[PDB]
Design a protein around this ligand. Structure first.
Ligand SMILES: CCCCCCCCO[C@@H]1O[C@H](CO)[C@@H](O)[C@H](O)[C@H]1O
Ligand SMILES: CCCCCCCCO[C@@H]1O[C@H](CO)[C@@H](O)[C@H](O)[C@H]1O
Length: 310
């Protein structure tokens, strides 16, 4: 027996469910950057997909159990992180991971410095193949909204910068010419909202942090955006923030979530607040309604989606 269902959205006179696509470099980037936004939309019935460009084979590992999986040892961390990503996405309401070009196609490029005995690094990949692979995904899923890193790739990791480059080119090529062309309605860059981070970090209390963690300072955040530079914000509810916390917890080899779930830290022990609001810059398409801050409050703003019956 097929379970009874109801179409939740209409776009004009046709039932049409919003589709969003987030493109990230490594496993856990989706949770750290857009976890609350993804959970926000999936819980509202929107179809959300996450594309991860690499397995994150060059990552470090927290703890001793999986320490020998690192690249300088057994070099099997990428395969192990597939499970962490799968569990993280499930926590956010996303079905399964989507690896660009197939899982294992292009390797984590690393943060530069260490060995690099690899003939398949994402940053060194032929744009014809990477852009081609992403175009196929975009034409298949036909996303109303695509999200990726800004030109500086957030912190500046080589793979984040490259993800921006490939996604930008793919969005541009997707509608020119899983076969028919598709022009993406809205294209955003996920960015760090400086003012939100500041108040968020200051609001953290002793029990939210482990004794060895330290809150970041100015010279540790040179890629934040001012409220003037931000174009949109998704202010999710506590349910969505809780899903983000759960997603982060799933990336056990990369992140440590505080005892109260209000903060988390990476291997560098740099504690960051786990906030419900995530910020964006409109990179392509026309914006919907803006609030008093001059920000849209829904990535789907202006696309004409309405709840069925309204
Ligand atoms: C149990 C989950 C119920 C989800 C009901 C879907 C609510 C949809 O709500 C609609 O979403 C659109 C796009 O975000 C907005 O533009 C509309 O203003 C809003 O009413
Ligand atoms: C620092 O950043 C880390 O670098 C690692 C190696 O490139 C990646 O695998 C991790 O996903 C990333 O967060």
């Amino acid at each position: 027996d097929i379970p009874t269902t109801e179409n939740l959205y209409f776009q004009g006179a046709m039932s049409e469910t919003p589709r969003l696509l987030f493109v990230h470099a490594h496993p856990d980037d989706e949770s750290l950057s857009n976890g609350a936004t993804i959970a926000h939309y999936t819980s509202r019935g929107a179809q959300v997909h996450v594309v991860t460009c690499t397995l994150g084979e060059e990552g470090e590992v927290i703890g001793d159990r999986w320490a020998q999986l690192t690249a300088d040892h057994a070099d099997q961390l990428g395969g192990y992180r597939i499970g962490e990503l799968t569990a993280a996405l499930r926590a956010l309401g996303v079905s399964a991971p989507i690896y660009l070009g197939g899982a294992g196609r292009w390797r984590d490029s690393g943060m530069a410095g260490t060995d690099q005995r690899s003939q398949r690094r994402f940053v060194d990949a032929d744009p014809r193949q990477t852009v081609g692979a992403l175009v196929a995904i975009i034409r298949e899923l036909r996303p109303h909204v695509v999200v990726t890193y800004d030109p500086n790739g957030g912190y500046g990791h080589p793979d984040h910068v490259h993800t921006h480059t490939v996604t930008t080119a793919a969005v541009a090529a997707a509608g020119v010419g899983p076969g028919d062309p598709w022009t993406v309605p809205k294209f955003y860059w996920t960015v760090l909202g400086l003012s939100a981070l500041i108040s968020g970090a200051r609001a953290l209390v002793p029990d939210d942090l482990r004794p060895e963690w330290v809150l970041p300072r100015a010279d540790e955040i040179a890629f934040g955006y001012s409220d003037d530079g931000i174009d949109a914000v998704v202010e999710a509810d506590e349910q969505a923030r809780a899903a983000k916390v759960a997603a982060l917890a799933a990336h056990a080899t990369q992140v440590v979530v505080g005892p109260t779930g209000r903060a988390a830290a990476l291997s560098n022990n740099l504690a960051l607040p786990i906030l419900a609001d995530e910020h964006y810059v409109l990179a392509g398409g026309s914006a919907g309604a803006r609030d008093e801050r001059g920000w849209e409050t829904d990535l789907l703003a202006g696309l004409g989606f309405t709840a069925s019956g309204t």
